Amino acid sequence: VVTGVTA
Amino acid sequence: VVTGVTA
Amino acid sequence: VVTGVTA
Amino acid sequence: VVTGVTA
Amino acid sequence: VVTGVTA
Amino acid sequence: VVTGVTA
Amino acid sequence: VVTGVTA
Amino acid sequence: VVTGVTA
Amino acid sequence: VVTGVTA
Amino acid sequence: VVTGVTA
Numbered sequence: 001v002v003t004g005v006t007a
Numbered sequence: 008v009v010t011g012v013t014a
Numbered sequence: 015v016v017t018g019v020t021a
Numbered sequence: 022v023v024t025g026v027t028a
Numbered sequence: 029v030v031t032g033v034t035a
Numbered sequence: 036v037v038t039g040v041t042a
Numbered sequence: 043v044v045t046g047v048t049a
Numbered sequence: 050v051v052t053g054v055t056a
Numbered sequence: 057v058v059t060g061v062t063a
Numbered sequence: 064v065v066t067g068v069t070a
Contacts, residue, residue, distance in 0.1 A: 001008045004023030004030070009025030010017045011030030011044070015036045016032030018044030018058070023030045032037070033047045037046030039058030039065070042056045043057045051060030053065030059066045
C-alpha cells in the first residue's frame with residue numbers, strides 16, 4: 001500500500 | 008505500507 | 015511501515 | 022514528491 | 029520528499 | 036517502522 | 043526529507 | 050523503530 | 057532530514 | 064538531522 005499527497 | 012505527505 | 019510528512 | 026515500494 | 033521501501 | 040516529520 | 047526502509 | 054522530527 | 061532503516 | 068538504524 002502506498003498513499004501519497006503532494007501539494 | 009508507505010504514507011507520504013509533502014507540502 | 016514508513017510514514018513521512020515534509021513541509 | 023512521494024515514492025513508495027511495498028513488497 | 030518522502031521515500032519509503034517496505035519489505 | 037520509520038516515522039519522520041521535517042519542517 | 044524523510045527516507046525509510048523497513049524489512 | 051526510528052522516530053525523527055527535525056525543525 | 058530523517059533517515060531510518062529498521063530490520 | 065536524525066539518522067537511525069535498528070536491527
